[PDB]
mmCIF file of all heavy atoms in Angstrom:
data_model
loop_
_atom_site.group_PDB
_atom_site.id
_atom_site.type_symbol
_atom_site.label_atom_id
_atom_site.label_comp_id
_atom_site.label_asym_id
_atom_site.label_seq_id
_atom_site.Cartn_x
_atom_site.Cartn_y
_atom_site.Cartn_z
ATOM 1 N N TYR A 1 0.821 -1.238 0.000
ATOM 2 C CA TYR A 1 0.000 0.000 0.000
ATOM 3 C C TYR A 1 0.848 1.278 0.000
ATOM 4 O O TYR A 1 2.011 1.198 0.433
ATOM 5 C CB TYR A 1 -0.847 -0.049 1.264
ATOM 6 C CG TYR A 1 -0.073 -0.372 2.516
ATOM 7 C CD1 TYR A 1 0.429 0.633 3.328
ATOM 8 C CD2 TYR A 1 0.153 -1.683 2.899
ATOM 9 C CE1 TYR A 1 1.131 0.346 4.485
ATOM 10 C CE2 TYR A 1 0.853 -1.990 4.054
ATOM 11 C CZ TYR A 1 1.345 -0.973 4.851
ATOM 12 O OH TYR A 1 2.040 -1.266 5.987
ATOM 13 N N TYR A 2 0.286 2.385 -0.503
ATOM 14 C CA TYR A 2 1.020 3.677 -0.565
ATOM 15 C C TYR A 2 0.052 4.822 -0.242
ATOM 16 O O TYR A 2 -1.074 4.818 -0.775
ATOM 17 C CB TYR A 2 1.604 3.892 -1.964
ATOM 18 C CG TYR A 2 2.885 3.146 -2.231
ATOM 19 C CD1 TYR A 2 2.872 1.893 -2.820
ATOM 20 C CD2 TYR A 2 4.112 3.690 -1.891
ATOM 21 C CE1 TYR A 2 4.043 1.201 -3.064
ATOM 22 C CE2 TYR A 2 5.294 3.010 -2.131
ATOM 23 C CZ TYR A 2 5.261 1.760 -2.722
ATOM 24 O OH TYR A 2 6.419 1.079 -2.965
ATOM 25 N N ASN A 3 0.501 5.787 0.565
ATOM 26 C CA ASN A 3 -0.347 6.956 0.915
ATOM 27 C C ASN A 3 -0.666 7.723 -0.371
ATOM 28 O O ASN A 3 0.247 7.866 -1.204
ATOM 29 C CB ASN A 3 0.373 7.861 1.920
ATOM 30 C CG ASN A 3 -0.414 9.094 2.314
ATOM 31 O OD1 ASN A 3 -1.338 9.503 1.618
ATOM 32 N ND2 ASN A 3 -0.046 9.700 3.431
ATOM 33 N N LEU A 4 -1.906 8.196 -0.522
ATOM 34 C CA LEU A 4 -2.299 8.989 -1.715
ATOM 35 C C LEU A 4 -1.162 9.947 -2.093
ATOM 36 O O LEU A 4 -0.872 10.055 -3.298
ATOM 37 C CB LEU A 4 -3.558 9.789 -1.378
ATOM 38 C CG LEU A 4 -4.030 10.733 -2.481
ATOM 39 C CD1 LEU A 4 -4.844 9.979 -3.518
ATOM 40 C CD2 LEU A 4 -4.831 11.887 -1.903
ATOM 41 N N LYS A 5 -0.538 10.593 -1.104
ATOM 42 C CA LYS A 5 0.543 11.584 -1.369
ATOM 43 C C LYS A 5 1.733 10.915 -2.069
ATOM 44 O O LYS A 5 2.307 11.547 -2.973
ATOM 45 C CB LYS A 5 0.962 12.256 -0.060
ATOM 46 C CG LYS A 5 -0.184 12.845 0.750
ATOM 47 C CD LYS A 5 0.206 13.195 2.169
ATOM 48 C CE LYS A 5 1.631 12.806 2.502
ATOM 49 N NZ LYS A 5 1.793 12.512 3.946
ATOM 50 N N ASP A 6 2.099 9.695 -1.657
ATOM 51 C CA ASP A 6 3.214 8.958 -2.311
ATOM 52 C C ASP A 6 2.849 8.689 -3.774
ATOM 53 O O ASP A 6 3.721 8.882 -4.642
ATOM 54 C CB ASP A 6 3.499 7.641 -1.585
ATOM 55 C CG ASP A 6 3.773 7.813 -0.104
ATOM 56 O OD1 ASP A 6 3.779 8.970 0.362
ATOM 57 O OD2 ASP A 6 3.978 6.787 0.576
ATOM 58 N N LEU A 7 1.603 8.288 -4.036
ATOM 59 C CA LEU A 7 1.142 8.028 -5.427
ATOM 60 C C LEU A 7 1.188 9.329 -6.234
ATOM 61 O O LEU A 7 1.610 9.278 -7.406
ATOM 62 C CB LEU A 7 -0.272 7.443 -5.359
ATOM 63 C CG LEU A 7 -0.366 6.111 -4.617
ATOM 64 C CD1 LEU A 7 -1.770 5.865 -4.095
ATOM 65 C CD2 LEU A 7 0.095 4.962 -5.498
ATOM 66 N N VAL A 8 0.794 10.452 -5.625
ATOM 67 C CA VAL A 8 0.821 11.777 -6.312
ATOM 68 C C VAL A 8 2.273 12.104 -6.668
ATOM 69 O O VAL A 8 2.506 12.595 -7.786
ATOM 70 C CB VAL A 8 0.209 12.881 -5.430
ATOM 71 C CG1 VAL A 8 0.529 14.270 -5.961
ATOM 72 C CG2 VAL A 8 -1.292 12.707 -5.260
ATOM 73 N N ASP A 9 3.210 11.817 -5.757
ATOM 74 C CA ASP A 9 4.648 12.102 -6.007
ATOM 75 C C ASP A 9 5.091 11.395 -7.290
ATOM 76 O O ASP A 9 6.199 11.704 -7.777
ATOM 77 C CB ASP A 9 5.510 11.714 -4.801
ATOM 78 C CG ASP A 9 6.986 12.016 -4.993
ATOM 79 O OD1 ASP A 9 7.299 13.001 -5.690
ATOM 80 O OD2 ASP A 9 7.812 11.261 -4.444
ATOM 81 N N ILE A 10 4.291 10.459 -7.815
ATOM 82 C CA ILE A 10 4.635 9.717 -9.064
ATOM 83 C C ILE A 10 3.767 10.252 -10.207
ATOM 84 O O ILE A 10 4.332 10.597 -11.263
ATOM 85 C CB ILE A 10 4.447 8.201 -8.870
ATOM 86 C CG1 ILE A 10 5.194 7.694 -7.633
ATOM 87 C CG2 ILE A 10 4.846 7.441 -10.125
ATOM 88 C CD1 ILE A 10 4.740 6.334 -7.162
ATOM 89 N N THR A 11 2.448 10.333 -9.995
ATOM 90 C CA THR A 11 1.524 10.794 -11.067
ATOM 91 C C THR A 11 1.183 12.266 -10.827
ATOM 92 O O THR A 11 0.556 12.561 -9.793
ATOM 93 C CB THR A 11 0.246 9.949 -11.097
ATOM 94 O OG1 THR A 11 -0.678 10.522 -10.171
ATOM 95 C CG2 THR A 11 0.493 8.497 -10.749
ATOM 96 N N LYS A 12 1.522 13.139 -11.776
ATOM 97 C CA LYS A 12 1.308 14.600 -11.590
ATOM 98 C C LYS A 12 -0.109 14.985 -12.030
ATOM 99 O O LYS A 12 -0.461 16.174 -11.889
ATOM 100 C CB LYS A 12 2.401 15.378 -12.323
ATOM 101 C CG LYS A 12 3.803 15.193 -11.760
ATOM 102 C CD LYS A 12 4.901 15.420 -12.775
ATOM 103 C CE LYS A 12 6.259 15.627 -12.139
ATOM 104 N NZ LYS A 12 6.288 16.849 -11.302
ATOM 105 N N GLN A 13 -0.904 14.001 -12.465
ATOM 106 C CA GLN A 13 -2.300 14.233 -12.928
ATOM 107 C C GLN A 13 -3.211 14.567 -11.737
ATOM 108 O O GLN A 13 -2.871 14.187 -10.596
ATOM 109 C CB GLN A 13 -2.819 13.013 -13.688
ATOM 110 C CG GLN A 13 -3.216 11.854 -12.785
ATOM 111 C CD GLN A 13 -3.110 10.522 -13.485
ATOM 112 O OE1 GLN A 13 -2.901 10.449 -14.694
ATOM 113 N NE2 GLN A 13 -3.254 9.449 -12.725
ATOM 114 N N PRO A 14 -4.374 15.221 -11.956
ATOM 115 C CA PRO A 14 -5.290 15.594 -10.872
ATOM 116 C C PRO A 14 -5.634 14.425 -9.933
ATOM 117 O O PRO A 14 -5.872 13.332 -10.414
ATOM 118 C CB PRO A 14 -6.553 16.092 -11.594
ATOM 119 C CG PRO A 14 -6.389 15.627 -13.027
ATOM 120 C CD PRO A 14 -4.894 15.615 -13.265
ATOM 121 N N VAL A 15 -5.663 14.701 -8.625
ATOM 122 C CA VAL A 15 -5.971 13.670 -7.590
ATOM 123 C C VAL A 15 -7.355 13.068 -7.866
ATOM 124 O O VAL A 15 -7.475 11.828 -7.817
ATOM 125 C CB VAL A 15 -5.890 14.257 -6.168
ATOM 126 C CG1 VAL A 15 -6.137 13.196 -5.103
ATOM 127 C CG2 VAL A 15 -4.565 14.963 -5.923
ATOM 128 N N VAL A 16 -8.354 13.916 -8.139
ATOM 129 C CA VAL A 16 -9.739 13.431 -8.414
ATOM 130 C C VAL A 16 -9.650 12.407 -9.546
ATOM 131 O O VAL A 16 -10.126 11.273 -9.356
ATOM 132 C CB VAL A 16 -10.685 14.597 -8.759
ATOM 133 C CG1 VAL A 16 -11.417 15.110 -7.528
ATOM 134 C CG2 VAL A 16 -9.960 15.733 -9.465
ATOM 135 N N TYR A 17 -9.046 12.796 -10.671
ATOM 136 C CA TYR A 17 -8.847 11.859 -11.806
ATOM 137 C C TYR A 17 -7.901 10.719 -11.398
ATOM 138 O O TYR A 17 -8.112 9.580 -11.852
ATOM 139 C CB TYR A 17 -8.504 12.635 -13.081
ATOM 140 C CG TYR A 17 -7.685 11.894 -14.100
ATOM 141 C CD1 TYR A 17 -8.000 10.597 -14.473
ATOM 142 C CD2 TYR A 17 -6.602 12.501 -14.714
ATOM 143 C CE1 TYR A 17 -7.250 9.918 -15.417
ATOM 144 C CE2 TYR A 17 -5.847 11.840 -15.665
ATOM 145 C CZ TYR A 17 -6.167 10.539 -16.012
ATOM 146 O OH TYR A 17 -5.416 9.878 -16.938
ATOM 147 N N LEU A 18 -6.862 11.027 -10.612
ATOM 148 C CA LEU A 18 -5.939 9.971 -10.110
ATOM 149 C C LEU A 18 -6.713 9.009 -9.205
ATOM 150 O O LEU A 18 -6.479 7.799 -9.311
ATOM 151 C CB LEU A 18 -4.783 10.616 -9.339
ATOM 152 C CG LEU A 18 -4.006 9.669 -8.428
ATOM 153 C CD1 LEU A 18 -3.452 8.492 -9.211
ATOM 154 C CD2 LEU A 18 -2.892 10.404 -7.704
ATOM 155 N N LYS A 19 -7.603 9.536 -8.360
ATOM 156 C CA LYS A 19 -8.430 8.677 -7.472
ATOM 157 C C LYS A 19 -9.298 7.777 -8.353
ATOM 158 O O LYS A 19 -9.418 6.599 -8.021
ATOM 159 C CB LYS A 19 -9.292 9.520 -6.530
ATOM 160 C CG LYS A 19 -8.609 9.939 -5.235
ATOM 161 C CD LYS A 19 -9.492 10.773 -4.333
ATOM 162 C CE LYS A 19 -8.825 11.131 -3.021
ATOM 163 N NZ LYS A 19 -9.694 11.984 -2.176
ATOM 164 N N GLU A 20 -9.830 8.309 -9.458
ATOM 165 C CA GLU A 20 -10.609 7.454 -10.392
ATOM 166 C C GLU A 20 -9.692 6.351 -10.931
ATOM 167 O O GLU A 20 -10.144 5.196 -10.959
ATOM 168 C CB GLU A 20 -11.181 8.294 -11.538
ATOM 169 C CG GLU A 20 -12.166 9.349 -11.074
ATOM 170 C CD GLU A 20 -13.239 8.842 -10.126
ATOM 171 O OE1 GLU A 20 -13.577 7.644 -10.203
ATOM 172 O OE2 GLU A 20 -13.728 9.646 -9.309
ATOM 173 N N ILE A 21 -8.451 6.686 -11.304
ATOM 174 C CA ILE A 21 -7.475 5.643 -11.749
ATOM 175 C C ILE A 21 -7.171 4.702 -10.574
ATOM 176 O O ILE A 21 -7.134 3.480 -10.797
ATOM 177 C CB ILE A 21 -6.190 6.275 -12.319
ATOM 178 C CG1 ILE A 21 -6.413 6.848 -13.719
ATOM 179 C CG2 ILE A 21 -5.046 5.273 -12.305
ATOM 180 C CD1 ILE A 21 -5.134 7.088 -14.487
ATOM 181 N N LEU A 22 -6.968 5.254 -9.372
ATOM 182 C CA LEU A 22 -6.724 4.411 -8.170
ATOM 183 C C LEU A 22 -7.972 3.575 -7.888
ATOM 184 O O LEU A 22 -7.824 2.369 -7.635
ATOM 185 C CB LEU A 22 -6.412 5.327 -6.985
ATOM 186 C CG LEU A 22 -4.990 5.879 -6.946
ATOM 187 C CD1 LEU A 22 -4.838 6.895 -5.827
ATOM 188 C CD2 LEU A 22 -3.982 4.752 -6.794
ATOM 189 N N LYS A 23 -9.171 4.169 -7.935
ATOM 190 C CA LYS A 23 -10.428 3.419 -7.658
ATOM 191 C C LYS A 23 -10.675 2.373 -8.752
ATOM 192 O O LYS A 23 -11.276 1.327 -8.437
ATOM 193 C CB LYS A 23 -11.633 4.356 -7.517
ATOM 194 C CG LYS A 23 -11.903 4.861 -6.108
ATOM 195 C CD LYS A 23 -12.987 5.915 -6.042
ATOM 196 C CE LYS A 23 -12.577 7.226 -6.676
ATOM 197 N NZ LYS A 23 -13.654 8.240 -6.587
ATOM 198 N N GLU A 24 -10.293 2.676 -9.996
ATOM 199 C CA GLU A 24 -10.525 1.739 -11.131
ATOM 200 C C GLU A 24 -9.725 0.450 -10.926
ATOM 201 O O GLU A 24 -10.291 -0.634 -11.168
ATOM 202 C CB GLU A 24 -10.086 2.398 -12.438
ATOM 203 C CG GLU A 24 -9.973 1.428 -13.600
ATOM 204 C CD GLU A 24 -9.025 1.880 -14.695
ATOM 205 O OE1 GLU A 24 -8.259 2.835 -14.456
ATOM 206 O OE2 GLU A 24 -9.052 1.276 -15.785
ATOM 207 N N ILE A 25 -8.475 0.557 -10.464
ATOM 208 C CA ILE A 25 -7.602 -0.649 -10.360
ATOM 209 C C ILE A 25 -7.333 -0.988 -8.892
ATOM 210 O O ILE A 25 -6.435 -1.816 -8.639
ATOM 211 C CB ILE A 25 -6.287 -0.401 -11.129
ATOM 212 C CG1 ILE A 25 -5.563 0.858 -10.643
ATOM 213 C CG2 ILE A 25 -6.553 -0.328 -12.621
ATOM 214 C CD1 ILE A 25 -5.062 0.802 -9.219
ATOM 215 N N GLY A 26 -8.059 -0.410 -7.928
ATOM 216 C CA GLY A 26 -7.710 -0.710 -6.525
ATOM 217 C C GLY A 26 -8.700 -0.160 -5.516
ATOM 218 O O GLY A 26 -9.704 0.446 -5.934
ATOM 219 N N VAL A 27 -8.420 -0.367 -4.225
ATOM 220 C CA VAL A 27 -9.312 0.141 -3.142
ATOM 221 C C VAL A 27 -8.435 0.829 -2.090
ATOM 222 O O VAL A 27 -7.235 0.500 -2.016
ATOM 223 C CB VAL A 27 -10.149 -0.997 -2.527
ATOM 224 C CG1 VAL A 27 -9.317 -1.878 -1.609
ATOM 225 C CG2 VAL A 27 -11.385 -0.477 -1.805
ATOM 226 N N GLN A 28 -9.004 1.780 -1.342
ATOM 227 C CA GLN A 28 -8.228 2.515 -0.310
ATOM 228 C C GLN A 28 -8.524 1.921 1.070
ATOM 229 O O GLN A 28 -9.716 1.794 1.409
ATOM 230 C CB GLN A 28 -8.573 4.007 -0.348
ATOM 231 C CG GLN A 28 -9.994 4.320 0.107
ATOM 232 C CD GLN A 28 -11.032 3.562 -0.680
ATOM 233 O OE1 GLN A 28 -10.871 3.303 -1.871
ATOM 234 N NE2 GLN A 28 -12.114 3.196 -0.014
ATOM 235 N N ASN A 29 -7.484 1.584 1.842
ATOM 236 C CA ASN A 29 -7.725 1.098 3.220
ATOM 237 C C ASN A 29 -7.247 2.171 4.196
ATOM 238 O O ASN A 29 -6.281 2.883 3.858
ATOM 239 C CB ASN A 29 -7.077 -0.265 3.470
ATOM 240 C CG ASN A 29 -7.500 -0.900 4.778
ATOM 241 O OD1 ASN A 29 -8.419 -0.420 5.439
ATOM 242 N ND2 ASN A 29 -6.833 -1.974 5.164
ATOM 243 N N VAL A 30 -7.926 2.307 5.335
ATOM 244 C CA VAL A 30 -7.427 3.251 6.376
ATOM 245 C C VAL A 30 -6.114 2.664 6.890
ATOM 246 O O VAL A 30 -5.359 3.394 7.551
ATOM 247 C CB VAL A 30 -8.450 3.458 7.512
ATOM 248 C CG1 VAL A 30 -9.548 4.430 7.112
ATOM 249 C CG2 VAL A 30 -9.044 2.142 7.990
ATOM 250 N N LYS A 31 -5.890 1.367 6.649
ATOM 251 C CA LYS A 31 -4.667 0.693 7.150
ATOM 252 C C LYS A 31 -4.629 0.903 8.661
ATOM 253 O O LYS A 31 -3.721 0.352 9.314
ATOM 254 C CB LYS A 31 -3.414 1.209 6.441
ATOM 255 C CG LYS A 31 -3.210 0.657 5.037
ATOM 256 C CD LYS A 31 -3.180 -0.855 5.014
ATOM 257 C CE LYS A 31 -3.478 -1.427 3.646
ATOM 258 N NZ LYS A 31 -3.335 -2.902 3.627
ATOM 259 N N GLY A 32 -5.585 1.677 9.189
ATOM 260 C CA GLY A 32 -5.634 1.811 10.637
ATOM 261 C C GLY A 32 -5.210 3.103 11.313
ATOM 262 O O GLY A 32 -5.448 3.284 12.509
ATOM 263 N N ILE A 33 -4.583 4.002 10.567
ATOM 264 C CA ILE A 33 -4.174 5.293 11.106
ATOM 265 C C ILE A 33 -4.549 6.331 10.066
ATOM 266 O O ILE A 33 -3.669 6.870 9.391
ATOM 267 C CB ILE A 33 -2.661 5.347 11.375
ATOM 268 C CG1 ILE A 33 -1.881 4.972 10.111
ATOM 269 C CG2 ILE A 33 -2.289 4.417 12.519
ATOM 270 C CD1 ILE A 33 -0.378 5.012 10.287
ATOM 271 N N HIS A 34 -5.852 6.533 9.817
ATOM 272 C CA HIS A 34 -6.291 7.461 8.733
ATOM 273 C C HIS A 34 -5.352 7.340 7.524
ATOM 274 O O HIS A 34 -5.284 6.235 6.954
ATOM 275 C CB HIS A 34 -6.368 8.900 9.262
ATOM 276 C CG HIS A 34 -7.534 9.671 8.745
ATOM 277 N ND1 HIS A 34 -8.474 10.242 9.585
ATOM 278 C CD2 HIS A 34 -7.928 9.956 7.485
ATOM 279 C CE1 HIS A 34 -9.389 10.854 8.861
ATOM 280 N NE2 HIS A 34 -9.080 10.691 7.572
#
């Protein structure tokens, strides 16, 4: 797993659109500490 911010440090595209790419191929877990 990687914090949204770590993924952004790789993809410079919009987070909303990046979240759609993240949501399309994956799911977000709180992993337990927000």
Side-chain angles (χ1 to χ4, degrees):
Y1 49 94
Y2 280 93
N3 179 341
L4 176 82
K5 308 166 356 209
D6 305 358
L7 298 157
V8 166
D9 181 32
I10 308 163
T11 87
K12 294 154 163 297
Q13 77 206 351
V15 183
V16 266
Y17 153 47
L18 162 57
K19 274 180 177 178
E20 297 311 332
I21 285 198
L22 281 173
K23 270 173 291 180
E24 166 204 13
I25 56 65
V27 75
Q28 68 304 326
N29 190 10
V30 281
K31 283 304 159 175
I33 54 179
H34 219 122

